[PDB]
Amino acid sequence: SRKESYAIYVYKVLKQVHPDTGISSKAMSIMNSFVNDVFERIAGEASRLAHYNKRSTITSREIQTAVRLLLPGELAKHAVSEGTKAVTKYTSA
């Protein structure tokens, strides 16, 4: 049956930073199960911030504040600035 994955989508980021290297199928299942874990910590935390404030919407502001809660130090500051760079390509174009 159709069991989806993030298998091909990790592969298109490996062929951006290191365009000659490959990846094993065990170390694909780690990155397939890495992305499935940082999902449940970001949408898991930004389902409390949009519940403590009696909102009902995961906006794009909570995923900013979910990331500044989880990610430590200088990964927060770069991934926040990777976010608003990529939602503004979405809003204009």
Partner: protein
């Protein structure tokens, strides 16, 4: 009105107040170098809690670090605090 850059309030966590926290832990003889080490470990614990405690308010668009948001800051680090709601 008053722009006071507050510095060295860490020296109010006094040498006879780390003694009494030592006593409630039930320890007998304290070194001379604990007193400038516990303040190094107190200022690490308060930095992690208040940075999350501000973030919960800064998202909530207030200028008050209310006691629901300190309790939520402690719950995220796995040190739940019963006594102020949640």
């Amino acid at each position: 009105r008053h722009r006071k850059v507050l510095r060295d309030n860490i020296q109010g966590i006094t040498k006879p107040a780390i003694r009494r926290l030592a006593r409630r832990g039930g320890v007998k003889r304290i070194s001379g170098l604990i007193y400038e080490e516990t303040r190094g470990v107190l200022k690490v614990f308060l930095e992690n809690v208040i940075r999350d405690a501000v973030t919960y308010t800064e998202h909530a668009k207030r200028k008050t670090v209310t006691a629901m948001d300190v309790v939520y800051a402690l719950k995220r680090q796995g040190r739940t605090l019963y006594g102020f709601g949640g």
